[PDB]
Paper text:
In the initial step of the fusion, it has been postulated that the vesicles and the plasma membrane are physically and reversibly connected through a heterooctameric protein complex termed the [name]. The [name] consists of Sec3, Sec5, Sec6, Sec8, [name], Sec15, Exo70 and Exo84. In this study, we report the near-full-length structure of zebrafish [name] (zSec10).
Among the expression constructs tested in this study, we obtained clusters of daggerlike small crystals from zSec10195–708 (Δ385–394). Bromide soaking improved the diffraction from ~4 Å to 3 Å or higher. The structure of zSec10195–708 (Δ385–394) was determined by a single-wavelength anomalous dispersion (SAD) method and refined to 2.73 Å. Residues 378–384 and 395–402 were invisible, probably owing to the structural disorder. The structure of zSec10 can be divided into five domains A–E, each of which is composed of an antiparallel helix bundle. Helix H7 is shared between domains B and C, whereas helix H11 is shared between domains C and D. These two long helices serve as the bridge connecting two adjoining subdomains. In contrast, zSec10 shows no substantial charge polarity on its surface, but several negatively or positively charged pockets were observed in its C-terminal half.
Residue numbers in the entry: -4 to 0, 195 to 377, 403 to 708
The structure:
């Protein structure tokens, strides 16, 4: 019939000014007809008009819902259905308008600020939805809020991961270019030991990626959180690893003079030092930040495999470079020995007038060794420096060991050999590595063989420093004696 439902305008008047049960009476009448849905509707519009006048909209709607809750119980019979209508109106209108307002402007002017706003707006909305769930709305309310948040973020959170990666690729690219421009280095003799490894570029790349993970944690669907957080990681290993540090490792690998003369190749040891600190900053953000997001991954086993693979590819290159730098040093110590150690040193031309000291070949080497050891300590941190010295010291002991075996020794030449080793031992003591010192300790005892009289030869072999050594090793040194044939020293087949 002629619905004079425009007594709904009588309800509007009652709400305008004055607190009354007149709102209740008109509402109680209106539930008898279709139009009770419209009455509560205009009630929501009116109480919202004077509300939004604050800098913070999420506090404004929090105060709005509390004052409406105490009033709605006075006016309507089923406050729970009215209340759900309220917050739905707040979300579908006010919240969605405030989100579209913040994002449209910054979307085509500041992509990073867009991501930081989308993250902030989504966080405050969820925190707000947790405040609204405290009210006695119709249970299953949790699903109700979830649909409201989804209906105003579904398309923002859909194209999220693509904008996040497009941003990170571009921002990382700009950081790398800005660094290679400040060094006047176009991609693909340099006297400077330029490592091309910035501890600023890496820490700024990690700064950027860390923040991307945090946004990824809350803005990515939990079912796709692992695959999304790993997509971001692959961007890091493409710019930080492949493009920055792996590039500087190959560039630094070509500045090695290849075991020749005149080598100012302190360069690569500086590269090893920086790369190690970079690695410590790398896996630190990996364990603390990326791992909590990837822990629940279907194929986490393949995620850890690529992380390991990447960090081993460059681990090997560092091991190739430390090896090439070491035999460059061994190459020079060998050069000193061949050109400055003659036969007449251990096989003196005239037995009569010989002053026994360590050879000039010995001092030239020890002086060189010490000059390089110093450069190693000054170019590396305490942890990885002892592993390098150990290798150098082992190779150092190896060189002298085989060097001593290509000479014949007279009675007089014997002492000169010990004097050499004794000085070599002091040079090795400067390594501060027990292994190197102990290796020359056995070589020192070994030289004792080509000095003692033939009758006390098998006696000395029974000594504490020699007994626990292989008989073949004792034999190799006895053969170096000039009177190995002149005496019955062939009794070393036992
Ligand atoms: Br009115
Ligand atoms: Br209703
Ligand atoms: Br952020
Ligand atoms: Br959240
Ligand atoms: Br409930
Ligand atoms: Br930078
Ligand atoms: Br990439
Ligand atoms: Br280091
Ligand atoms: Br980090
Ligand atoms: Br001496």
């Amino acid at each position: 019939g002629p619905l004079g439902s425009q007594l709904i305008q009588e309800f509007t008047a009652a709400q305008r000014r004055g607190e009354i049960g007149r709102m209740r009476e008109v509402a109680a009448v209106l539930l008898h007809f279709k139009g009770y849905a419209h009455c509560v509707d205009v009630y929501i519009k009116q109480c919202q008009e004077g509300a939004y006048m604050r800098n913070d909209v999420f506090e404004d709607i929090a105060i709005l819902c509390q004052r409406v809750n105490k009033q709605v119980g006075e006016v309507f019979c089923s406050p729970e259905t009215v209340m759900a209508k309220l917050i739905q109106s707040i979300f579908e209108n006010k919240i969605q308008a405030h989100v579209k307002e913040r994002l449209d402007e910054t979307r085509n002017s500041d992509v990073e600020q867009y991501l930081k706003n989308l993250y902030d707006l989504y966080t405050r909305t969820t925190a707000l939805a947790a405040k609204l769930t405290d009210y006695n709305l119709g249970s299953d309310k949790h699903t109700f809020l979830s649909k409201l948040i989804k209906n105003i973020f579904s398309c923002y959170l859909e194209s999220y991961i693509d904008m996040e990666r497009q941003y990170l690729q571009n921002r990382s690219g700009m950081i790398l270019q800005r660094y290679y421009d400040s060094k006047n280095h176009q991609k693909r003799i340099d006297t400077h030991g330029e490592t091309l490894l910035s501890q600023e570029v890496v820490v700024n790349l990690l700064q950027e990626t860390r923040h991307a993970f945090e946004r990824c944690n809350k803005l990515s669907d939990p079912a796709d959180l692992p695959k999304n957080a790993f997509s971001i990681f692959l961007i890091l290993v493409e710019y930080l690893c492949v493009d920055h540090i792996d590039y500087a490792l190959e560039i630094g690998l070509s500045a090695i003079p290849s075991a020749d003369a005149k080598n100012a190749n302190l360069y690569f040891l500086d590269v090893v030092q920086q790369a190690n600190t970079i690695f410590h900053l790398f896996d630190k953000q990996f364990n603390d930040h990326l791992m909590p997001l990837i822990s629940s991954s279907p194929k986490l086993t393949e995620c850890l495999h690529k992380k390991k693979e990447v960090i081993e590819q460059m681990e090997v290159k560092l091991d190739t470079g430390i090896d090439r730098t070491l035999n460059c040093m061994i190459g020079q110590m060998k050069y000193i020995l061949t050109t400055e150690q003659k036969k007449t040193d251990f096989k003196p031309e005239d037995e009569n007038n010989v002053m026994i000291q360590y050879t000039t070949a010995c001092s030239k080497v020890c002086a060189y060794v010490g000059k390089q050891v110093e450069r190693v300590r000054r170019s590396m941190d305490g942890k990885n420096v002892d592993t390098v010295l150990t290798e150098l010291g082992v190779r150092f002991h190896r060189l002298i060991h085989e060097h001593l075996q290509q000479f014949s020794y007279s009675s007089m030449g014997g002492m000169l050999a010990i004097c050499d080793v004794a000085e070599y031992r002091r040079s090795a003591k400067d390594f501060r590595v027990p292994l190197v010192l102990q290796l020359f300790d056995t070589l020192h005892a070994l030289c004792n063989l080509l000095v003692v009289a033939p009758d006390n030869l098998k006696q000395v072999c029974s000594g504490e420093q020699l007994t626990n050594l292989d008989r073949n090793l004792l034999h190799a040194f006895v053969q170096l004696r000039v009177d190995y044939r002149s005496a019955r020293l062939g009794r070393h087949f036992s």
